[PDB]
Coordinates of C-alpha atoms and ligand atoms in Angstrom, one line a residue:
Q1 CA 50.1 92.5 92.8
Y2 CA 51.6 96.1 92.4
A3 CA 53.3 96.3 95.9
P4 CA 56.7 94.7 95.4
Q5 CA 56.8 93.4 98.9
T6 CA 60.4 94.3 99.5
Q7 CA 61.8 94.9 103.0
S8 CA 61.2 98.5 104.0
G9 CA 63.2 100.9 101.8
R10 CA 64.7 98.3 99.5
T11 CA 63.8 99.5 95.8
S12 CA 65.3 97.3 93.2
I13 CA 65.4 93.7 92.1
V14 CA 68.3 92.0 90.3
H15 CA 67.8 89.3 87.7
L16 CA 70.5 86.7 88.5
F17 CA 70.1 85.0 85.1
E18 CA 70.9 81.4 85.1
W19 CA 72.5 81.4 88.5
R20 CA 72.4 78.2 90.6
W21 CA 70.3 78.2 93.8
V22 CA 73.4 77.7 96.0
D23 CA 75.1 80.7 94.5
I24 CA 72.1 83.0 94.9
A25 CA 71.7 82.0 98.7
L26 CA 75.4 82.8 99.3
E27 CA 75.0 86.0 97.3
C28 CA 72.1 87.1 99.4
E29 CA 74.1 86.7 102.6
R30 CA 77.5 88.0 101.5
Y31 CA 76.3 90.8 99.3
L32 CA 72.6 91.5 98.4
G33 CA 71.4 91.8 102.0
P34 CA 74.2 94.0 103.2
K35 CA 74.2 96.3 100.1
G36 CA 70.4 97.1 100.2
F37 CA 69.1 95.0 97.3
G38 CA 65.4 94.4 97.5
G39 CA 65.2 91.1 95.7
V40 CA 66.2 88.6 93.1
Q41 CA 64.3 87.4 89.9
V42 CA 65.5 83.8 89.3
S43 CA 65.4 81.6 86.2
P44 CA 62.4 79.2 85.7
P45 CA 62.6 76.7 88.7
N46 CA 60.5 74.0 87.1
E47 CA 61.7 71.1 84.9
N48 CA 62.4 71.6 81.3
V49 CA 63.3 69.6 78.2
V50 CA 67.0 69.1 77.5
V51 CA 68.0 70.7 74.2
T52 CA 71.1 69.1 72.5
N53 CA 71.1 70.9 69.2
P54 CA 72.4 73.5 69.9
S55 CA 74.1 72.2 73.0
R56 CA 72.1 73.4 76.1
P57 CA 70.9 76.9 75.1
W58 CA 69.8 79.3 77.8
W59 CA 66.3 79.1 76.3
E60 CA 65.6 75.4 76.9
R61 CA 64.5 76.6 80.3
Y62 CA 61.4 78.3 78.6
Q63 CA 60.1 74.7 77.5
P64 CA 58.3 73.3 80.6
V65 CA 57.7 69.5 80.9
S66 CA 56.4 69.4 84.5
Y67 CA 56.3 71.6 87.6
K68 CA 58.9 69.6 89.5
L69 CA 61.5 71.9 91.1
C70 CA 64.3 70.3 89.3
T71 CA 66.6 72.2 87.0
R72 CA 70.3 72.9 86.2
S73 CA 70.1 75.5 88.9
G74 CA 69.3 72.9 91.5
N75 CA 66.7 70.6 93.1
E76 CA 63.8 71.4 95.4
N77 CA 65.9 71.3 98.7
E78 CA 68.4 73.8 97.3
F79 CA 65.6 76.0 96.1
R80 CA 63.9 76.0 99.6
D81 CA 67.2 76.7 101.3
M82 CA 67.9 79.6 98.9
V83 CA 64.4 81.2 99.5
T84 CA 64.8 80.7 103.4
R85 CA 68.5 82.2 103.4
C86 CA 67.5 85.2 101.2
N87 CA 64.3 86.0 103.1
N88 CA 66.1 85.8 106.4
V89 CA 68.6 88.6 105.3
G90 CA 65.7 90.7 103.8
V91 CA 66.1 89.8 100.1
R92 CA 62.9 88.6 98.3
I93 CA 62.7 85.9 95.5
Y94 CA 60.7 86.5 92.4
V95 CA 60.0 83.5 90.2
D96 CA 59.9 83.5 86.5
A97 CA 56.5 81.7 85.9
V98 CA 56.4 80.0 82.5
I99 CA 52.7 79.3 82.4
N100 CA 51.6 80.0 78.7
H101 CA 52.9 76.8 77.2
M102 CA 54.8 73.5 77.6
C103 CA 57.8 72.7 75.3
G104 CA 58.1 72.8 71.6
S105 CA 55.8 70.5 69.7
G106 CA 58.5 69.0 67.5
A107 CA 60.7 68.0 70.5
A108 CA 61.3 64.3 70.7
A109 CA 59.4 61.9 72.9
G110 CA 61.3 60.4 76.0
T111 CA 63.0 61.3 79.2
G112 CA 65.6 63.8 78.1
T113 CA 64.3 66.3 80.6
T114 CA 66.2 67.9 83.6
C115 CA 64.5 65.7 86.2
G116 CA 64.0 62.6 84.0
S117 CA 60.1 63.0 83.6
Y118 CA 58.7 61.3 80.5
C119 CA 56.8 63.4 77.8
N120 CA 55.6 62.9 74.3
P121 CA 55.2 66.4 72.9
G122 CA 53.9 65.1 69.6
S123 CA 50.9 63.4 71.2
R124 CA 50.7 66.3 73.9
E125 CA 51.3 63.9 76.7
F126 CA 53.0 65.3 79.9
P127 CA 52.2 62.4 82.3
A128 CA 54.2 64.1 85.2
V129 CA 51.7 67.1 85.5
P130 CA 49.4 65.4 84.0
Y131 CA 48.5 67.2 80.9
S132 CA 46.8 65.5 77.8
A133 CA 45.9 66.6 74.3
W134 CA 42.7 68.3 75.4
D135 CA 44.6 70.6 77.7
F136 CA 46.1 72.6 74.7
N137 CA 44.8 75.0 72.3
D138 CA 45.3 73.2 69.0
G139 CA 41.6 73.3 68.0
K140 CA 41.1 76.9 69.2
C141 CA 43.9 78.2 66.9
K142 CA 42.7 79.2 63.4
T143 CA 46.0 79.7 61.4
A144 CA 47.3 77.5 58.7
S145 CA 50.7 77.0 60.5
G146 CA 49.2 76.7 64.1
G147 CA 51.6 79.5 65.1
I148 CA 51.2 83.2 65.5
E149 CA 51.3 84.6 62.0
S150 CA 50.2 88.2 62.8
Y151 CA 50.4 90.2 65.9
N152 CA 47.5 92.2 64.6
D153 CA 45.0 89.6 65.6
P154 CA 44.5 89.2 69.4
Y155 CA 43.1 85.6 68.9
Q156 CA 46.1 84.1 67.2
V157 CA 48.7 85.6 69.5
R158 CA 46.8 84.2 72.6
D159 CA 45.5 81.0 71.1
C160 CA 48.2 79.9 68.8
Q161 CA 51.7 78.6 69.4
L162 CA 54.4 81.1 70.1
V163 CA 57.5 79.8 68.1
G164 CA 56.0 76.4 68.1
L165 CA 55.5 76.0 71.9
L166 CA 52.5 73.8 73.0
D167 CA 49.9 76.4 74.0
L168 CA 48.1 75.6 77.2
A169 CA 44.2 76.0 77.4
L170 CA 44.1 78.4 80.1
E171 CA 40.3 79.0 80.0
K172 CA 39.8 75.5 81.6
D173 CA 39.7 75.2 85.3
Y174 CA 41.8 72.1 85.2
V175 CA 44.8 74.0 83.6
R176 CA 44.0 77.0 85.8
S177 CA 44.0 74.8 89.0
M178 CA 47.2 72.9 87.9
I179 CA 49.1 76.2 87.4
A180 CA 47.7 77.8 90.6
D181 CA 48.8 74.7 92.7
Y182 CA 52.4 75.1 91.3
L183 CA 52.6 78.8 92.1
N184 CA 51.0 78.2 95.7
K185 CA 53.6 75.6 96.3
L186 CA 56.2 78.5 95.6
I187 CA 54.4 81.0 97.8
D188 CA 54.3 78.6 100.7
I189 CA 58.1 78.1 100.4
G190 CA 58.4 81.9 100.7
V191 CA 58.5 83.4 97.2
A192 CA 57.3 87.0 97.1
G193 CA 55.9 87.1 93.6
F194 CA 56.3 86.3 89.9
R195 CA 57.4 87.5 86.6
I196 CA 54.6 86.1 84.4
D197 CA 56.2 84.9 81.2
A198 CA 54.8 85.8 77.9
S199 CA 51.7 87.5 79.4
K200 CA 50.8 88.9 75.9
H201 CA 50.2 85.3 74.8
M202 CA 47.4 84.7 77.4
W203 CA 44.0 86.5 77.8
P204 CA 44.1 89.0 80.8
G205 CA 41.1 87.3 82.3
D206 CA 42.7 83.8 82.4
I207 CA 45.7 85.2 84.2
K208 CA 43.2 86.9 86.6
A209 CA 41.5 83.6 87.4
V210 CA 44.8 82.0 88.1
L211 CA 45.8 84.9 90.4
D212 CA 42.5 84.7 92.2
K213 CA 43.4 81.1 93.2
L214 CA 46.8 82.2 94.9
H215 CA 47.5 82.1 98.6
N216 CA 48.6 85.0 100.7
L217 CA 52.3 85.3 101.4
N218 CA 54.1 83.2 104.0
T219 CA 53.6 85.0 107.3
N220 CA 57.0 83.9 108.7
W221 CA 58.4 86.6 106.6
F222 CA 55.4 88.7 105.3
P223 CA 52.6 90.6 107.0
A224 CA 49.2 89.3 107.5
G225 CA 47.2 89.5 104.3
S226 CA 50.0 90.1 101.8
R227 CA 49.2 89.4 98.2
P228 CA 52.0 88.2 95.7
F229 CA 53.8 90.9 93.7
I230 CA 53.0 90.2 90.0
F231 CA 54.8 91.8 87.0
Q232 CA 53.7 90.6 83.5
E233 CA 56.0 90.4 80.5
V234 CA 54.0 92.2 77.7
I235 CA 56.1 93.8 74.8
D236 CA 54.2 96.7 73.7
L237 CA 56.2 99.3 71.8
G238 CA 53.0 100.3 70.0
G239 CA 51.8 99.5 66.4
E240 CA 50.0 96.2 67.3
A241 CA 46.7 95.0 68.4
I242 CA 47.5 94.3 72.1
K243 CA 48.2 97.1 74.6
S244 CA 49.9 97.0 78.2
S245 CA 46.9 98.6 79.7
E246 CA 44.8 95.5 79.0
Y247 CA 46.9 93.8 81.8
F248 CA 46.9 96.5 84.4
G249 CA 44.2 94.8 86.6
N250 CA 46.5 91.9 87.2
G251 CA 49.5 93.7 88.4
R252 CA 52.6 95.5 87.0
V253 CA 53.7 95.4 83.4
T254 CA 57.2 95.4 81.8
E255 CA 57.6 98.9 80.1
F256 CA 59.8 97.9 77.1
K257 CA 59.6 101.5 75.7
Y258 CA 61.8 102.7 78.7
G259 CA 65.0 100.8 77.6
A260 CA 64.4 101.3 73.9
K261 CA 64.1 105.1 74.3
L262 CA 66.9 105.5 76.9
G263 CA 69.3 103.6 74.8
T264 CA 68.6 105.9 71.8
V265 CA 68.9 109.0 73.9
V266 CA 72.2 108.0 75.5
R267 CA 73.7 106.7 72.2
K268 CA 72.7 110.2 70.7
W269 CA 71.0 108.5 67.7
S270 CA 68.2 110.0 65.8
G271 CA 68.8 113.6 67.0
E272 CA 68.0 112.6 70.7
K273 CA 69.5 114.6 73.4
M274 CA 69.8 114.0 77.1
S275 CA 68.2 117.4 77.9
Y276 CA 65.0 115.9 76.4
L277 CA 64.9 113.6 79.4
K278 CA 63.5 116.6 81.5
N279 CA 60.0 115.2 81.1
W280 CA 60.9 111.4 81.2
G281 CA 58.2 109.1 82.4
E282 CA 54.5 109.5 81.3
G283 CA 55.5 112.6 79.5
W284 CA 57.3 110.3 77.0
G285 CA 54.2 108.2 76.6
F286 CA 55.1 105.4 79.1
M287 CA 52.5 103.7 81.3
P288 CA 51.6 105.1 84.8
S289 CA 54.7 105.0 87.1
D290 CA 52.8 102.8 89.6
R291 CA 52.1 100.2 86.9
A292 CA 55.6 99.9 85.5
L293 CA 58.5 97.6 86.0
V294 CA 61.6 99.3 84.3
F295 CA 65.1 98.1 83.2
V296 CA 67.7 99.1 80.6
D297 CA 68.0 95.6 79.2
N298 CA 66.6 92.1 80.0
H299 CA 67.9 88.6 79.3
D300 CA 66.2 88.6 75.8
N301 CA 67.1 91.9 74.2
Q302 CA 70.7 92.1 75.5
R303 CA 71.3 89.2 72.9
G304 CA 68.8 90.5 70.3
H305 CA 65.8 88.2 71.3
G306 CA 62.4 89.8 72.0
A307 CA 62.2 93.4 71.0
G308 CA 64.4 96.4 71.6
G309 CA 66.6 96.0 68.7
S310 CA 69.9 97.9 68.2
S311 CA 69.6 100.8 70.8
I312 CA 69.4 98.6 73.7
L313 CA 72.6 99.2 76.0
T314 CA 74.1 96.1 77.6
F315 CA 77.3 95.3 79.6
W316 CA 79.1 95.1 76.2
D317 CA 78.9 99.0 76.1
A318 CA 80.0 99.4 79.7
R319 CA 80.5 103.1 79.8
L320 CA 77.2 104.1 78.2
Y321 CA 75.5 101.3 80.1
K322 CA 76.5 102.7 83.5
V323 CA 75.1 106.2 82.7
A324 CA 71.8 104.6 81.5
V325 CA 71.5 102.5 84.7
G326 CA 72.6 105.4 86.8
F327 CA 69.9 107.7 85.3
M328 CA 67.3 104.9 85.7
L329 CA 68.2 104.3 89.3
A330 CA 68.2 108.0 90.1
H331 CA 64.9 108.9 88.3
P332 CA 61.5 108.4 90.3
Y333 CA 59.6 106.5 87.5
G334 CA 58.8 102.8 87.8
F335 CA 60.0 99.9 90.0
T336 CA 63.7 99.2 88.9
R337 CA 65.2 95.9 87.8
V338 CA 68.9 95.6 87.3
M339 CA 70.4 92.9 84.9
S340 CA 73.3 90.5 86.0
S341 CA 74.7 88.5 82.9
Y342 CA 77.2 86.0 81.8
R343 CA 79.6 86.6 78.8
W344 CA 79.2 84.6 75.6
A345 CA 81.3 84.7 72.3
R346 CA 79.3 86.8 69.9
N347 CA 79.5 86.0 66.2
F348 CA 77.7 88.5 63.9
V349 CA 76.6 87.6 60.4
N350 CA 74.5 90.3 58.7
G351 CA 74.3 92.3 61.8
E352 CA 72.9 89.5 64.0
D353 CA 74.7 87.4 66.5
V354 CA 74.2 83.7 65.5
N355 CA 75.7 82.7 68.9
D356 CA 72.8 84.2 70.9
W357 CA 71.8 80.7 71.9
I358 CA 74.9 80.0 74.2
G359 CA 74.0 79.1 77.6
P360 CA 75.6 79.8 81.0
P361 CA 79.3 79.0 81.9
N362 CA 79.3 75.3 82.3
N363 CA 81.6 72.4 82.5
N364 CA 80.1 69.9 80.0
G365 CA 76.6 71.0 80.8
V366 CA 76.8 71.6 84.7
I367 CA 76.6 75.3 85.4
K368 CA 79.9 76.7 86.9
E369 CA 79.8 78.4 90.3
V370 CA 80.1 82.1 90.7
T371 CA 83.5 82.7 92.1
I372 CA 84.2 86.1 93.7
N373 CA 87.6 87.7 93.1
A374 CA 89.6 89.7 95.7
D375 CA 88.4 92.9 93.9
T376 CA 84.7 91.9 94.3
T377 CA 84.3 91.1 90.6
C378 CA 83.1 87.5 89.6
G379 CA 85.0 84.8 87.9
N380 CA 83.9 82.0 85.4
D381 CA 82.6 84.6 82.8
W382 CA 79.7 85.7 85.1
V383 CA 80.0 89.5 84.5
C384 CA 78.1 90.4 87.8
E385 CA 77.1 94.0 86.8
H386 CA 75.2 94.2 90.1
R387 CA 78.6 94.2 91.7
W388 CA 80.1 97.1 89.6
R389 CA 80.6 100.0 92.0
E390 CA 78.7 102.5 90.0
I391 CA 75.7 100.3 89.7
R392 CA 75.9 99.0 93.3
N393 CA 76.1 102.6 94.7
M394 CA 73.2 103.8 92.6
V395 CA 70.9 101.1 93.9
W396 CA 71.9 102.5 97.4
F397 CA 71.2 106.1 96.3
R398 CA 67.7 104.9 95.2
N399 CA 67.0 103.6 98.7
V400 CA 68.3 106.8 100.3
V401 CA 66.0 109.0 98.1
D402 CA 62.9 106.8 97.9
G403 CA 59.7 109.1 98.1
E404 CA 61.5 112.3 97.3
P405 CA 60.4 114.6 94.5
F406 CA 62.2 115.1 91.4
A407 CA 63.8 118.6 91.9
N408 CA 66.3 121.1 90.5
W409 CA 66.7 119.9 86.9
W410 CA 69.3 121.7 84.8
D411 CA 70.7 121.0 81.3
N412 CA 73.1 122.8 79.0
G413 CA 70.7 122.6 76.0
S414 CA 72.4 119.5 74.8
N415 CA 73.7 116.4 76.6
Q416 CA 74.7 117.6 80.0
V417 CA 71.8 117.2 82.5
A418 CA 71.5 117.4 86.3
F419 CA 68.7 116.8 88.9
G420 CA 68.1 116.1 92.5
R421 CA 65.6 114.1 94.6
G422 CA 64.3 116.3 97.4
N423 CA 67.1 117.6 99.8
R424 CA 68.6 114.0 99.7
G425 CA 70.6 113.2 96.5
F426 CA 71.8 114.9 93.3
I427 CA 73.3 113.5 90.2
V428 CA 74.9 115.4 87.2
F429 CA 75.8 113.8 83.8
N430 CA 78.0 114.9 80.9
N431 CA 77.3 113.1 77.7
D432 CA 78.6 115.9 75.5
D433 CA 82.0 115.7 73.7
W434 CA 83.4 118.7 75.5
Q435 CA 83.5 119.4 79.3
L436 CA 81.1 120.5 82.0
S437 CA 81.9 123.3 84.4
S438 CA 78.8 124.7 86.3
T439 CA 77.9 125.7 89.7
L440 CA 74.6 123.9 90.2
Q441 CA 71.8 124.2 92.8
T442 CA 71.9 120.7 94.4
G443 CA 69.2 121.2 97.1
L444 CA 71.4 119.4 99.8
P445 CA 72.7 120.9 103.1
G446 CA 76.2 122.3 102.7
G447 CA 79.2 120.0 103.4
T448 CA 81.6 117.8 101.7
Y449 CA 80.0 114.7 99.9
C450 CA 81.7 111.7 98.5
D451 CA 80.9 111.0 94.9
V452 CA 79.7 107.4 94.9
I453 CA 80.3 106.8 91.1
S454 CA 84.1 107.2 91.4
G455 CA 84.3 106.1 95.0
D456 CA 82.9 105.4 98.4
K457 CA 82.7 107.2 101.8
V458 CA 85.1 105.2 104.0
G459 CA 85.0 106.5 107.6
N460 CA 85.6 110.2 107.5
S461 CA 87.0 110.2 103.9
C462 CA 86.2 109.4 100.3
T463 CA 88.0 107.0 98.0
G464 CA 87.1 109.2 94.9
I465 CA 86.0 112.7 94.0
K466 CA 84.8 115.0 96.9
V467 CA 82.1 117.6 96.2
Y468 CA 81.8 120.6 98.5
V469 CA 78.3 122.1 98.5
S470 CA 78.2 125.5 100.0
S471 CA 75.7 127.0 102.6
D472 CA 73.1 127.7 100.0
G473 CA 73.1 124.4 98.2
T474 CA 75.2 125.3 95.1
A475 CA 78.3 123.2 94.2
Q476 CA 80.7 123.6 91.3
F477 CA 81.0 120.5 89.2
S478 CA 83.7 119.8 86.6
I479 CA 83.4 116.7 84.5
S480 CA 85.6 115.9 81.5
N481 CA 84.1 114.2 78.5
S482 CA 87.0 111.8 78.7
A483 CA 86.2 110.7 82.2
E484 CA 86.0 107.1 83.1
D485 CA 82.4 107.5 84.2
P486 CA 81.2 111.0 83.0
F487 CA 78.7 111.6 85.9
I488 CA 78.7 112.2 89.7
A489 CA 76.1 111.3 92.3
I490 CA 76.0 112.4 96.0
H491 CA 73.4 111.8 98.6
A492 CA 72.6 112.4 102.3
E493 CA 74.4 109.2 103.3
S494 CA 77.7 110.0 101.5
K495 CA 78.2 113.3 103.4
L496 CA 81.3 113.5 105.5
Ligands
LIG501 C1 61.3 86.3 73.1 C2 59.9 87.0 73.2 O1 59.3 86.7 71.9 C3 58.0 87.3 71.7 O2 58.1 88.8 71.7 C4 57.7 89.3 70.4 C5 59.0 89.5 69.5 C6 59.7 88.2 69.1 O3 58.8 87.6 68.1 O4 58.6 90.3 68.4 C7 58.0 91.4 68.7 O5 57.7 92.2 67.5 C8 56.7 91.1 69.4 O6 55.9 92.4 69.6 C9 57.0 90.5 70.7 O7 55.8 90.2 71.4 C10 57.1 86.9 72.9 O8 55.9 87.9 72.9 C11 57.8 87.2 74.2 O9 56.9 86.7 75.3 C12 59.1 86.4 74.3 N1 59.9 86.6 75.5 C13 59.5 85.6 76.6 C14 58.9 84.3 76.1 C15 59.6 83.1 75.9 C16 58.9 81.8 75.7 O10 58.7 81.3 77.1 C17 61.1 83.1 75.9 O11 61.5 82.7 74.5 C18 62.7 81.9 74.5 O12 62.5 80.6 74.7 C19 61.9 79.9 73.5 C20 61.6 78.5 73.8 O13 62.8 77.8 74.0 C21 62.9 80.2 72.3 O14 62.4 79.5 71.2 C22 63.3 78.4 70.9 O15 62.6 77.2 71.1 C23 61.5 77.1 70.1 C24 60.9 75.7 70.3 O16 59.6 75.9 70.9 C25 62.1 77.2 68.6 O17 61.0 77.3 67.7 C26 62.9 78.5 68.5 O18 63.6 78.6 67.2 C27 64.0 78.5 69.6 O19 64.7 79.7 69.6 C28 63.0 81.6 72.0 O20 63.8 81.9 70.8 C29 63.5 82.3 73.3 O21 63.4 83.7 73.0 C30 61.7 84.4 76.3 O22 63.1 84.2 76.9 C31 60.8 85.1 77.3 O23 61.6 86.2 77.9
CA502 CA1 48.4 81.3 74.8
CL503 CL1 61.0 90.5 81.1

């Protein structure tokens, strides 16, 4: 539940949003294993309805029609092969469990599903599971529309239909047992844990009854009595009836205040300043660090779905995005999840992108493979942020400094900020519109360190900036506000 189950000393997961199972296994072997990534959150592995208007949106995968492992990402054999191949190189797989609902209630009856199962959403018939009309919450919901009309009433957000999706009656043992069996089939293949989708739309105790039915992890890869890692998706920015803390007994919770506040601070909106990040973490009103899964953006709010709104930084704001991700990866708070996206054509009318439905790169509906270019970037409009040097090297810095205290904070009173992590890593940021020239106490042994944002340590040299720290730990840093990446990070393993 709160222990991530990563191989020892791997501290981040990557969401490889809409990637095919064959591409994720090859990425585990050629890249994620070698570069120290802890694991991968994958898209929903179970069968979904095919949505033709608009043509194949990313969100049709959030409309279950059975628990068959049969999707545009692949079939069951390809899924099992990906989970074996990643586990064997020390990279864990986390499944997005869509267990609150089936598909939308106005979807058409038939076999337009990703594996050909039949369903009749209007009569609530899902013969491939099987579910029937008494496995849903239509009678339990008291609103006129049957949907969630107010997030100020706990009963309607848990018992009514979220954007018209058929709401499962999770208090019944039948539904509980049907979901537990799907999830145990996944654990047996070798999955390490689950993102529980739309946890806010389910009662904490029904989630707990499902969790109590789950198997220990597969001992080919995991220790004796290991329990699945669980993180629950609950959007709680405040101001509503449901709080994150109601879900803390079940496992970790998505802290959505983290990317909303960080975005604002880094964009310097509302009078926010990077020097205010001195007390970042619970000091800013976030949940306990041991309960939180943290991220700058997720698949929903990078395209304006969910919540986060305008301050969320994404790959579209690359320079500011890298300083937000570098700060998140250097700070001790939370378990970190990094985003990996595909590019879509945005079209804003009245400040909203009306193209936020567009699904993954595809050729007439079949998802295009991730091609790797000679310069290690991806092709086919996969943007592969997890492969950007600055992000790549900061997931490594987090593994090097794991368990080290926040130390040696400095700020210039405005937007230049620096801090270390024990005597093992130090990062300095300049988000002011003038330059930085300070001699800072780093806490590291004296020596020449390669900056891992502008470069790499290759043999006995650096490809980028070289920082000398003197015998007492201080080092002079100079960073222009016009720099490519306005921040420098050095750690025990980038010492020459
Ligand atoms: C998204 C989200 O949502 C919600 O959140 C909320 C928001 C919005 O409303 O707001 C705020 O304020 C609050 O607070 C919050 O809470 C919920 O909660 C969550 O959970 C979500 N997220 C999640 C979930 C889901 C489901 O599964 C998803 O979603 C997606 O998908 C869907 C389905 O497909 C869609 O929808 C669609 O379809 C439908 C049918 O049924 C219709 O109706 C519509 O229109 C369409 O669109 C949506 O949209 C999407 O988003 C997600 O992804 C996850 O993550
Ligand atoms: Ca529900
Ligand atoms: Cl999430």
